[PDB]
């Protein structure tokens, strides 16, 4: 009765950051030792939780968020951060209580392309908000009528993700673990 963390971390293909996947985790036991003993990850930053002691606590619900960004943009996956990814694609709350895990995936997500991110938006995303709109972004006063042109921009932009790029430009698969305890039956326990 183990939690399906493998289906998230070891997924064959990840979602674009503007359309980040979220996996609800409940009514299961999780051996986090696999996650926190690994050497594949390049960054594993936790806020308000201790991953090395995650095997001795029960949460009510755990959310796993999956997406792909650039190496330069990994720092934007953190509370109180600003930038195109944080403002327009994926935003963490200031009181975030969870772990942010990222690793280089230049071998899996770079071709000698399809991952996208939102480039234009009127206002910043609220924390844990998902926006998949493809409506033509109206940069002027004239309505766009859903066609690209002057003062009418497509809101999404495609990453490069080519094997010859620098490390900061290479794709990085990111999994964000969200933990909530609250006052409720805690049905997500460790191997305790």
């Amino acid at each position: 009765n183990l939690c399906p963390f493998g289906e998230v971390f070891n997924a064959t293909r990840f979602a674009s950051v503007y359309a980040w996947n979220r996996k609800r985790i409940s009514n299961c036991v999780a051996d986090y030792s696999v996650l926190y003993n690994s050497a594949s990850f390049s960054t594993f930053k936790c806020y308000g939780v201790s991953p090395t002691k995650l095997n001795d606590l029960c949460f009510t619900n755990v959310y796993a968020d999956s997406f792909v960004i650039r190496g330069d943009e990994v720092r934007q996956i953190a509370p109180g951060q600003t930038g195109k990814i944080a403002d327009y694609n994926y935003k963490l709350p200031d009181d975030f209580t969870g772990c942010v895990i990222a690793w280089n995936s230049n071998n899996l997500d770079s071709k000698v392309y399809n991952y996208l991110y939102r480039l234009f938006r009127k206002s910043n995303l609220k924390p844990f908000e998902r926006d998949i709109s493809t409506e033509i972004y109206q940069a002027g006063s004239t309505p766009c009528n859903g066609v690209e042109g002057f003062n009418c921009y497509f809101p999404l932009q495609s990453y490069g993700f080519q094997p010859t790029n620098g490390v900061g430009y290479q794709p990085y698969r990111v999994v964000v673990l969200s933990f909530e305890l609250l006052h409720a039956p805690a049905t997500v326990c460790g191997p305790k």
Partner: antibody
Amino acid sequence: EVQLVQSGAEVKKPGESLKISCKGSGYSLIMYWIGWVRQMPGKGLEWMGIIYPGDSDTRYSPSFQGQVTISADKSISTAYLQWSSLKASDTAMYYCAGGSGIFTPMDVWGQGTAVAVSS
Amino acid sequence: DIVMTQTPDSLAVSLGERATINCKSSQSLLYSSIKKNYLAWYQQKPGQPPKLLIYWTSTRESGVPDRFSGSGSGTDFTLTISSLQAEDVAVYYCQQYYSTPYTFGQGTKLEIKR
């Protein structure tokens, strides 16, 4: 489990520069945030700062902001505490403590480095 | 900065007796999302580095004997030792990790009442 090993004892004249180190080993190191705790002789524990080795996310206590410099080198799993100009009032034992997150208790502690600044 | 105050400064109880150390915080240490108070207890033996005993005010570190126990809520917290042993003679600190900067208590010196 992570263990922390610190550099040896240091004896310095006032006005000199010092750099002690704190190197960790074992699996799950890339989780541990490394902080520095000062303990003057016969006194309590003072929290100086903390740094995450992965991206050098350094945060200082207001009492130690600008007095010391905290850096890291993630290629050798080593954290550093540096003084530009030592004073006689810096004579204390310095521990490095580690915790698998920020806003998380520090479970792994180093053996401690004794620093004496005297003429 | 949050202020941690411990009572008393020094305490002496006999072998097998109960030792009680108080720790008052100037601010609530309760995280809203994870409803556990972000308080820790540390033990420092003479010549030894501090050792973490209790975190989240009730959960004990692995290998910490059953004689140690923590309680309290809000701004008042308590560390209790059921049967004091000669190996428990040390200085005990309460530390909060609710927000930076981290702040410790002044410490409590525990000896054996003989």
